[PDB]
């Protein structure tokens, strides 16, 4: 925790869901190949549930929630959505209820398989992949509010200014430990909170490190414009200026949830050469978009890849992955 950042987060009521600072490891092989030293930060060992990037976010969201006397959080995401599970399982630990408004092929495997095991409540609605279940969440929060039950709705991937503070803290932690001075930091980009917080923070530490987000789906206008808005409201939350938005390379292969022989080979590669697993929906496309850039000489000499968990995907869509190797 960096002096300044601490000082700026200390006002926000957060729930402490993590005990240790997750490790930053160096990857010998992917460095020899690609040709750059790439370090990986195990945010997938954040510990709660299947771990991952969300846990850090839940700390400021559910921290908040347990304030506004909420007693039943709602969230959204894919049916395989890690965040959805982790937000759910987390909701329950802090002694709260949780309703997941999922969307997709009802498959009893992966995170949806977990969702049940843990008994988290599940509600699916075949609807515009635009993640517009975000409206089903509300009707749901309305009627529950019409019962005197105080809910708490969470935005796709905790893409909330307050959940954003999640990585804003993660940058301070990356600064207390890092022995390496990074030129760029990669990380998949789903809803934009990881890039936001990570960016709001860097800017706060005013570090000459480049915030590189590896888009993994939509992008059009929304993903980059809305990205900027998000990181704006966040700063206005911390009451500070912005130091020009990050980078954002699309490596989604066209559509979210697409599993290609490239997202697939890079899985077996990182796994069989470094001994770390990444998934075919998030982390796998971003490590793949890590090699691409590090070979085109676009990342610098020292690069840190923030592993964001998602371990359930590799099991969920393990069948496709096979038919591709």
Ligand X SMILES: Cc1ncc(COP(=O)(O)O)c(CNC2(C(=O)O)CC2)c1O
Site string for ligand X, 148-187 (x = CB under 6 A): --------xx-x----------------------------
Of ligand X, a second copy, none, which one sits near residue 325, judging by CB under 5 to 8 A according to partner kind? a second copy
Query: Could you say which of 92, 218, 232, 245 contacts a second copy (CB under 8 A)?
Result: 92
Which range in 62-70, 132-140, 265-273, 297-305 contacts a second copy by CB under 8 A?
265-273
* 257 is a site residue for a second copy (CB under 8 A): no
What lies within 8 Å, CB to CB, of 120 at 6+ separation is: 85, 88, 89, 92, 98, 100
Of ligand X, a second copy, none, which one sits near residue 192, judging by CB under 5 to 8 A according to partner kind? ligand X
d(CA 295, CA 208): 21
CA of 84: how far to CAs of 12, 70, 90, 119, 206, in Å?
Answer: 23, 18, 10, 13, 33
Of ligand X, a second copy, none, which one sits near residue 110, judging by CB under 5 to 8 A according to partner kind? a second copy
Of ligand X, a second copy, none, which one sits near residue 304, judging by CB under 5 to 8 A according to partner kind? none
d(CA 325, CA 315): 15
Strand 24-26 versus strand 37-42 pairing type = antiparallel
The answer to whether the Cα torsion of 143, 144, 149, 153 is positive or negative is negative
* 314 is a site residue for ligand X (CB under 6 A): no
* 318 is a site residue for a second copy (CB under 8 A): yes
**DSSP string computed for 133-190:** GGGHHHHHHHHHHTTT--EEE--GGG-SHHHHHHHHHHHHHHHHH--S--SEEEEEES
Q: Residue 286 Cβ, how far from ligand X at the closest point, in Å?
A: 7
* 78 is a site residue for ligand X (CB under 6 A): yes
What lies within 8 Å, CB to CB, of 126 at 6+ separation is: 103
The residue annotated as part of the active site, out of 81, 203, 252, 312, is 81
Site string for a second copy, 174-203 (x = CB under 8 A): ------------------------------
* 59 is a site residue for a second copy (CB under 8 A): no
Query: Are 174 and 200 in contact, with CB atoms under 8 Å apart?
Result: no
Q: Is 160 considered catalytic here?
A: no
- Identify residues after which the chain is interrupted (C–N over 2.5 A): none
Q: Which is nearer to a second copy, 202 or 277 (CB)?
A: 277
Q: Residue 224 Cβ, how far from ligand X at the closest point, in Å?
A: 12
For residue 271, the number of C-alpha atoms closer than 13 Å in the C-beta half-sphere is 14
The binding site for ligand X (CB under 6 A) comprises 52-53, 77-78, 81-84, 156-157, 159, 188-195, 279, 282-283, 308-310
Residues forming the active site: 81
The binding site for a second copy (CB under 8 A) comprises 17, 19-20, 23-25, 29, 42, 45, 47-51, 89-90, 92-93, 108-110, 113-114, 116-120, 264, 267-268, 271-277, 311-312, 314-315, 318-319, 321-322, 325
């Amino acid at each position: 925790m960096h002096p300044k950042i601490f000082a700026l987060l200390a006002k926000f009521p957060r729930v402490e869901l993590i005990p240790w600072e997750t490790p930053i490891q160096y990857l010998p092989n992917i460095s020899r190949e690609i040709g750059a030293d790439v370090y990986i930060k195990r945010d997938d060992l954040t510990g709660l549930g299947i771990g991952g990037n969300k846990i850090r976010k839940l700390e400021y969201l559910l921290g908040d929630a347990l304030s506004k006397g909420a007693d039943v959080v709602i969230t959204v995401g894919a049916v395989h959505s890690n965040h959805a599970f982790v937000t759910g399982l987390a909701a329950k630990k802090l002694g709260l209820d949780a309703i997941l408004v999922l969307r997709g092929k009802e498959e009893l495997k992966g995170n949806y398989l977990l969702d049940k095991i843990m008994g988290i409540e599940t509600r699916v609605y075949d609807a515009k992949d635009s993640f517009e279940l975000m409206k089903y969440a509300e009707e749901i929060a309305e009627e529950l509010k019409r019962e005197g039950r105080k809910p708490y709705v969470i935005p796709p991937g905790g893409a909330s200014p307050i959940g954003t503070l999640g990585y804003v803290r993660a940058v301070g932690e990356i600064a207390t430990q890092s022995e390496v001075k990074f030129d760029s930091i990669v990380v998949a980009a789903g809803s934009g909170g990881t890039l936001a917080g990570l960016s709001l923070g860097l800017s706060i530490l005013n570090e000459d490190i480049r915030p590189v987000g590896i888009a993994v789906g939509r992008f059009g206008e929304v993903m980059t414009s809305k990205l900027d808005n998000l990181i704006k409201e966040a700063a206005e939350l911390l009451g500070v200026k912005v130091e020009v938005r990050p980078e954002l390379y699309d490596y989604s292969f066209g559509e979210y949830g697409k599993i290609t022989g490239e997202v697939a080979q890079i899985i077996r590669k990182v796994g069989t050469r470094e001994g770390i697993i990444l998934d075919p929906v998030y982390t796998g496309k971003a490590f793949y978009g890590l090699v691409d850039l590090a070979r085109k000489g676009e990342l610098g000499e020292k690069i840190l890849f923030i592993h964001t968990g998602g371990i359930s995907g590799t099991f969920h869509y393990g069948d496709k992955l096979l038919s591709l190797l």
